[PDB]
């Protein structure tokens, strides 16, 4: 995260850390949606251009963390994966279209003050909140500039209109994506940065007071460049696939 701030303890209880068994290293961000399920960016697991292809045995899921590197004894829970599900039509070849995956934990995790799931949007929550100008919140343990925080960071960014999004890059944008960030104009900054991928973009409903996950950290060209924006997977648009798997697979 570029130009964010340290989160307060218990601020994002659904924030998960994707962690490599060896070398022991942070792979990506992720989010807890139920006691046995984690949501992330498919390119965090599979990306052939960089020879990336993770298997369940290759990783660990670390929940309830605040510090990027200590092992938070008595606070964090470290779990194992039973299965990984990647959207059958994820486009790693051209633009990261449908950049989404589900991971099912080996054993359900227990909730605590620091560990709690986020909600998934319904058609009407999506319709009222996903509007140009409204702000969402991104979190993660990524680079501070295009270097590593000691604690989870946070930033609030406005959603940007589709046209502006498309005129800012040469990549082909689809309905499965949305872009967020300030204008060069707006004179406020911030963005996601390498290591933030697979994390959550959340909003707080003004109707029921709950936090919903609207997007997943997907891609960007540089970090915090003027006239560039961050792109996120559109969670609601892919909701039918999510249902379908949690149904069929426990």
């Amino acid at each position: 995260i570029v130009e964010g701030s340290d989160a307060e303890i218990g601020m994002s209880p659904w924030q998960v850390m994707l962690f490599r068994k060896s070398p022991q290293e942070l792979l990506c961000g992720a989010s807890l949606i139920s006691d046995r399920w984690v949501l992330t960016a498919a390119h965090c697991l599979l990306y052939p251009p960089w020879d990336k292809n993770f298997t369940e045995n290759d990783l660990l899921v670390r929940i309830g963390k605040h510090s990027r590197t200590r092992y938070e004894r008595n606070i964090e829970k470290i779990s194992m994966l039973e299965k990984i599900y990647i959207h059958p039509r994820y486009n790693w070849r051209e633009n990261l279209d449908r950049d989404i995956a589900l991971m099912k934990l080996k054993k359900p995790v227990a909730f605590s003050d620091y560990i709690h799931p986020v909600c998934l949007p319904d058609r009407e929550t999506a319709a009222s909140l996903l509007q140009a100008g409204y702000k969402g919140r991104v979190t993660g343990w990524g680079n501070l500039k295009e270097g590593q925080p000691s604690v989870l960071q946070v930033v609030n960014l406005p959603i940007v209109e589709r046209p502006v999004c498309k005129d800012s890059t040469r990549i082909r944008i689809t309905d499965n994506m949305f872009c967020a960030g300030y204008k060069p104009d707006e004179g406020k900054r911030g963005d996601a940065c390498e290591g933030d991928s697979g994390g959550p973009f959340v909003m707080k409903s003004p109707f029921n007071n709950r936090w919903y996950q609207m997007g997943i950290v997907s891609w960007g060209e540089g970090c915090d460049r003027d006239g560039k924006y961050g792109f996120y997977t559109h969670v609601f648009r892919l909701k039918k696939w999510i249902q379908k798997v949690i149904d069929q697979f426990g």
Binding site: K21, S22, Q24, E25, L26, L60, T69, Y71, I78
Partner: peptide, 10 residues
């Protein structure tokens, strides 16, 4: 520098 994790997790 990632502080190490307990053996039972690997």
């Amino acid at each position: 520098d990632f502080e190490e994790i307990p053996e039972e997790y690997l």
